[PDB]
Design a protein around this ligand. Structure first.
Ligand SMILES: N[C@@H]1[C@@H](O)[C@H](O[C@@H]2O[C@H](CO)[C@@H](O[C@@H]3O[C@H](CO)[C@@H](O[C@@H]4O[C@H](CO)[C@@H](O[C@@H]5O[C@H](CO)[C@@H](O[C@@H]6O[C@H](CO)[C@@H](O)[C@H](O)[C@H]6N)[C@H](O)[C@H]5N)[C@H](O)[C@H]4N)[C@H](O)[C@H]3N)[C@H](O)[C@H]2N)[C@@H](CO)O[C@H]1O
Length: 236
């Protein structure tokens, strides 16, 4: 079976998401990413945009300090605990930004980021996609939704988005046509993307994922070409 967790499909998924987050297919270059993009989530960092506002950057740092005691970020745990649930930089700032840059040089921090990615975002996407009888492209649709909207049963989280899809169209696991199901899933997601100004550009769906679907590239196979934000990417 061709799934998004095969080595090449996973590598493709990482480049897709890095194009959407960082306008680069060079996903391995993004572990050191750190920016407050003025969305109200505070610091956004690393491969998949962990945030200081939403809990996951804190969870990542705590896991990193478990596996690598005394790393440069560990001293910023109390400040990450204090700012969680807000976009405050209080207690972080230049020393924290330099500590992120230092940690991103280490295989240990990259491994922590990979682990958090896989536990919270990638493995749930793939497992749920397979349960729904989706192809690699469908699993990808799930993974990008979890990256942007996060896990959860709320209407604006992955679980709610998937629920809304299922209300509109049967998944392939129940005999539904995959194209119709993914159209309904993209259209459920579109609604949610548009409710937030930082998310209102939907090009990561419209000029990339919908294009793969139109092309019938269900295995998300290379060569692949797409656009996001008006810029073209390709993978071979
Ligand atoms: N060549 C130029 C172009 O570059 C230029 O275009 C710009 O290009 C920028 C660079 O690529 C681009 O910036 C990126 O924009 C995106 C979209 O805003 C940013 O993406 C962010 O992705 C984060 C991913 O992690 C999101 O974070 C997640 O948020 C969710 C929802 O809050 C959370 O979920 C909760 O999690 C908890 C568990 O912790 C759970 O309890 C809850 O239930 C969950 N719901 C996650 O925790 C969190 N990780 C974030 O939402 C999202 N905004 C990215 O960072 C930017 N770098 C620009 O957008 C783009 N315009 C163009 C412009 O014209 O010009 C060309 O010439």
């Amino acid at each position: 079976t061709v799934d998004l967790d095969a080595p090449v499909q996973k590598d493709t998924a990482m480049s897709l998401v890095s194009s959407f987050e960082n306008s680069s297919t060079d996903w391995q270059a993004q572990y050191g990413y750190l920016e407050d993009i003025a969305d109200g989530r505070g610091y956004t960092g690393g491969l998949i945009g962990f945030t200081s506002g939403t809990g996951d950057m804190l969870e990542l740092v705590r896991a990193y300090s478990a596996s690598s005691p005394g790393n440069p970020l560990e001293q910023y745990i109390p400040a990450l605990e204090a700012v969680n649930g807000t976009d405050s930089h209080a207690g972080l700032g230049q020393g924290f930004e330099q500590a992120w840059a230092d940690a991103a040089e280490t295989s240990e921090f990259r491994a922590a980021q990979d682990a958090e990615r896989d536990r919270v975002y990638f493995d749930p996407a793939v497992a749920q996609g397979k349960a729904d009888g989706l192809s690699a492209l469908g699993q990808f649709a799930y993974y990008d939704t979890l990256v942007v909207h996060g896990p959860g049963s709320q209407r604006d989280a992955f679980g709610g988005i998937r629920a809304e899809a299922l209300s509109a169209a049967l998944p392939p696991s129940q005999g539904g046509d995959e194209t119709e199901y993914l159209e309904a899933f993209f259209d459920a997601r579109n609604v949610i993307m548009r409710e937030e100004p930082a998310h209102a550009d939907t090009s990561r769906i419209d000029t990339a994922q919908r294009v793969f679907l139109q092309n019938g590239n269900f295995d998300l196979e290379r060569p692949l070409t797409w656009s996001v934000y008006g810029d073209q990417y390709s993978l071979n």
